[model samples]
Every structure is written in C-alpha cells, then in structure tokens.
Target: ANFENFIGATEGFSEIAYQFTSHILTLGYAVMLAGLLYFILTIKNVDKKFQMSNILSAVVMVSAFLLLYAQAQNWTSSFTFNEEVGRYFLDPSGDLFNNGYRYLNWLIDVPMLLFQILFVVSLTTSKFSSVRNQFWFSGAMMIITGYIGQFYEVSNLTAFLVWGAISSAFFFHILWVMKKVINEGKEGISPAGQKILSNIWILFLISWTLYPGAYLMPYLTGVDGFLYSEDGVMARQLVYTIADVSSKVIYGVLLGNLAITLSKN
Candidate 1:
C-alpha cells in the first residue's frame, strides 16, 4: 500500500518535475559546454592570465549533473534506485526519500561554499588592490546571512526582523560588490574575474533558490516529511522549477556573450 501510494504521487507531480528538470538540465549542459569552449578560446585568442578559472565552471557542471541525475531517476528521492544502478535512489515522495536526498546533496552541493570562499580568496590575492576586496567580505556576509535565513526557514521564525536583517545584509552586500566593480573600471581586471562576475549572480540566485525549493517539494504537495509542511514543500518546489529553469537559460546566453566580450576586451 505504501509503495502504491508513492507511485500514485509520482503520477501527480512527475510532469512538473520532469519539465522543470529537463529545462534546467538543457540550460546547464549547454552553458557548461559553451563556457568550457569559451575558456579555451580566450586562452588561445587573448593575452590574459596564464590560467583561466575553470574551477567554478567545473563546480557548476557538477552541480548541474547532480540535478539532472536526481531528476532523471525520479524526482521522488535521491535514493530511489535507478534500475540501471540497482540500488535505492532517494525518491522525494516520502520523508525517508527526501531526507536521504538532502544528505547526499550535502556531499555534492555543499562544496559550493569553497567556490564562494575561493572567490573571496581571489580578491585578497588580486593584483587589483583598488578593487575594494569585495569577494571575501561580501561572500562571508552573504553566507552568514543566508545560513541565518535557512535557520528561520526551518524553525519558522516569522519575526519580520529576522527576515529583514537577513535579506538586507545579504542583498545590500551584493549591491556593494557590483558598485565596486562599476567604480573600479574594467581596465586591469583579468578575464577570469570578468567571467565570474558577469553572469555569476544570475547563476547564484537560480541555483540556491532551486536546491532548497526542490528539497521542500513533498510537504508543499502535502506529503509527510521529516521537515516542512505540505504547502511549504510545494512552494519550495515551485520556486526551484521557475527560478532554475529561467536562470539557466539566461546563464547560457549571458555567459556566452560575456566570455566573448572578455576575450575581445
């Protein structure tokens, strides 16, 4: 009976899941390929840094692959096995499934912290001292504020002040970074820096929003879970679908354009 109910739920939500996942998968794959190509071409086409920063790009692809694989398997849970893999692959239709997905995700998705950390590290080591060292400071603040928000999300801190502080600190820091870039002018910054800043914000918004949102899908749809209500789960899933699908498309186009621009300028 439990297995049958799970299968029934899959019928209800799988289409939305598939559509959202496929759109993101296509965008992610395309942008990753384009970015890699652009990275190589820039090294060949322009006289810039001895090395291009492909670490973030590689991370992007890994994250994207995680999404694609999870979705292709069933969007039910990460442990709900792929018949091909012959093991339990998490399916999101139940708590055991979603929680399992969350755990596996912590392994792959959490490394994004380092990617952000390195961005800040670059600013410190950067030759452009006048650039205002935006990476380390802002990245730290954003990470802190975002983690707080995650706590609020889990704990149901409806206090307006809690959310306000989180949103203000994080969003304003983003503003600070962009403002620094504009003020610095584009003369001495490396192509690598340019590439990262150009479309990265877009990717950041979409990816972060999607991952949490997707994980919460079961509750939003009214399925029981270790965390979150059905409505909360569903709402998160919607955000993931809408934001991720849109951002990845934008990411591919903007990143490709930015890459070419970096090569030229």
Candidate 2:
C-alpha cells in the first residue's frame, strides 16, 4: 500500500500530464464554487421546509472547494521543470500530493450528500434523524474502510483487495439505505420530484463507483504489474475530477431542483 508513494511522484511528467492534472482540478474546484452560488441564489425559490436541501448543497460545495483547492495547490507545488528531460519532476523541497486529501473531504461531504437526499423528500423529524444516523454511520464506514485499503494500494495486494471489498460492501449498503429512504420518502412526492430522485440515485451510483475503478487503475497493467505512466496519473486525476463533479456538484443542483418542485403546492 503506502499510497503516499504513489507513482505520480515517482516519474517525471510530460507537459500534458502536469498541465492536464492541474487544469482538471482547477475545473473541479471551480464547479464547486459555481454550485455553491447556485444553491445560495436559488434557495429562496424552495419552501422553508425544503430549504435545508439547498443549504446542505451549499455546505457540500464549500467543503469540496477547500479540498479541491488544496488538491490543486498541492499538484502545482509538488513539481518543477526538468530542462534536460523535458518533463517535470518532483521538487526536492516539495511534498507528494496524495489523493488522501480527497478522502478526507469525502468523510464530511459523503454523509451530507446522502442527507441532502432526505431533504429532497419529506420525512418527519424523528424519521429524518433516524435515517441520518444510518447515513452517517454507513458513509463513514464506506470511506474509512476504503481509506484503510488505499494505504496498502502499492504495498500489500491482499490487504488492498480485502479492504476494498469490505469498503465496497459498505458502499452497496449505503445505496441500499438510499433506496429504502427514497422509496418510502417519495410516497407522496410530485411526479417531477419522483423522477429527479431516481435520477439522482442513478447518478450517485455511477459517480461513486468511479472511485473503485480509479483505485484499481494503478493495478491495471500486466499480471501483478502497476500503472505508473505519467499519462496514467493524469487519467486517474481525470476520473477523480469528473466523479467529484457529478457526485457532489451536479447532485446538489439536481437535489435543489427536486426541492423546488416538491415545495410547490
């Protein structure tokens, strides 16, 4: 594992590799900013009871913005140009940028994201508190378990595989909880709200699954070989950025829209 020793810092990166990673992260963080503005500006359109959804969305955007900004700053700071090799190499004085910052961010955003789902549909305070407990617990387990596995990504294959599977179990469990919440909560929801709920469900599933795939990317070469190319690093960054946007930013926007629809009498 030892994910801090990730291949991205091991090899010299070509221009595109460095540029693309930096730019994508910039894009990702900017999207979070725009999402924050969207949620804040549109919250007035929803009823008081449902305004929590947009408020929650704004919270997620703010959290994501910090992490993504840290992530981008880390990327830019970690490298220096190599005139001879025509590639950027790790700066002797800089630190390796670990994706763990993202994991840390997810620790907060993930639970809140699922909680945002609760506000999009109606739930009694008792029911909401109970479901929020479940979401918090499951979300923490999913991210923490995966974080443990991520540590052993390049060091112990078995531990990596085992921890990943355990984390995946939690992932599915979280989805199961969402399915149940949405099913029960949408009972009297407007048709448009119902459609957005299911669409958001599918969006959640797709965006989250990308993490495991990107996690596997390092192990995606020959038998027992790892992906260490500069290009692969950029590719993983691409996947992570896209997943972040869809899962958090777009998910928040759609949830806000759902709240607006449901708030109408």
Candidate 3:
C-alpha cells in the first residue's frame, strides 16, 4: 500500500507537470518548424537552395533546448516529498533511490527520449555521408529501443543502454565529421562552426563527470549501501543540475553564435 501510495502521490503531481510541459515542448516544436519553414521559403524566393542539413541543425538545437522541460518535470517530481521514505521495491534488487526512480521515470525520461530522437534527426543532416545513412537505420532502432524501455518499466540499466547507444551514434558521427574536416579543406565547415562544435563537445565531457558523482557516491566513504541520505542526495542533485544547466548554456550559446555568424556570412 505504501509502495502504491508513494508512486501515486509523486506521479499524480508529475502528470500535471508533464501535461503542462508537454504542451510547452509542443510549442517549441512549432516554433522550430515555423522558423525552418520561413527560412526555407525566404531562401527559395531568393533562388537559394534550401539546405535540408542546415535547417535540421536548427531543429535539433531547439529540440535539445526543449529537453529542459523534462528536466524540470523530473526535478519537480523527484523533490515532491522531502522527508517521507516510501516502499519502492518491485524487484529484488531495487533500492530506495531506485524506488524513487521508478515513481517518476516516464515523465522524466520521455523528454530525454524526445531529445535522442531529435539528435538522430539532426545527424541525418551531418556532413559525413555515413552518418546520414546510419541515422536512417538508427532512428527506427532507437524508437524500438525506447518502446522497449517503457515496456520494461524504466529500469536504470535499460535507460542507460538506450541513451548510451544513442550517444554512441552521435559521438561516432562527430568523429566521422572530424575526420572529414581533416581530409578536406575547410570549405563547408566554417571556423565558427568548429568553435561551436568544440565548445559543445567539451561541455558534454563535463556532463559525464556527473556520473561518477552520482553512481559512485557510496564507495567514497566506505558506505555499504547506496547513498540516499539527504546530504548524499543533495550533493548528487547539485552535480546533476550543474552539469545539465552547463550543457544547455553551452549549447544555447553555440546555437546563438552560429546564427549570428551565418547571418553575417
């Protein structure tokens, strides 16, 4: 009964946030789509070929920005109950934190899922030809993987594997493009683009640092159990928040600066 109560209480509030944020994310999608369409139409009127890849880059940037909605939803739901420890063990191996995890996994994870999907969509527009083809295949695979993740009821390992594989695809695509830059002259990829890419990639690495703080906290002080105490939780929360916010700030600046450069060029 406590298990159900715990999940129900958090999820009820999360549903409201999810609904509100879902509407907001849809607005983001609309803005992206409208801007892209307008850009293409204007370019077409001026006899310029509307580049699919460039337009899609902006789409991906907006999608990534919209992922913040899910981040907000996660934070709101995760912190709903400050003091009560709830029963969350559906499986033998689940811990208190994990029980907490299962309670709001969908509302929190769906935004991440959308972000991955948009990343794949954007990869299809990459300079590397292989990445485009791989995205053609990987998109469907990732969707199926997401469906599987939801069906499995939000296992941490499952979410990790899905996100990890998507991240791998994105990472490999970046490497492929970097190789192209090395082989070819600096023609299509401008200096500004390279700077933005470098900035975002560095921030991405910074984000990975949060994982060690999150997953390895128990081992730091000889604690036998997982670190779910208030102090431990707060520390990891700060880590996650800082990393996430840093990532968005860097990426947003990259996009903004890129747009400025493009307008000048």
| Candidate number with greatest TM-score | 2
> lDDT by residue for model 2 over 1-265, one digit each (tens)?
1332354456577888789889999999999998889889998888898888888889999999999999899889888888997878777688866667899999989888887777667663337788889889988998999999888777787998999999899888888877788788668878878898888888988998898888777566743454556655677789999999999888888887887777678
Which RMSD values do the candidates have, in order? 8.6, 2.3, 9.6
**C-alpha local distance difference test of each model:** 0.43, 0.81, 0.39
Candidate 2 lDDT (Cα, 0 to 1):
0.81
Question: Which candidate would rank higher by lDDT, 1 or 3?
Answer: 1
Candidate 1 global CA lDDT score: 0.43
Q: Report the poorest 10 consecutive residues by lDDT, candidate 1.
A: 1-10
Q: Write the per-residue lDDT of candidate 3 for residues 52-80, one digit (tens) a residue.
A: 33344444434534554444443334333
Note the residue pairs that clash in candidate 3: none
lDDT of 1 by residue, 115-214 (tens): 3323322343334433335544554565444444444333354532365356456546645554444334334557564655545554655555565445
Measured against the true structure, the TM-scores of the candidates, in listed sequence, are: 0.47, 0.91, 0.41
Task: Indicate the worst ten consecutive residues by lDDT in candidate 3.
Answer: 87-96
Candidate 2 ranges with C-alpha deviation above 4 Å:
1-10, 123-126, 222-228
Q: Distance (Å) between predicted and true CA of 166, model 2?
A: 1.4
Best by lDDT: 2
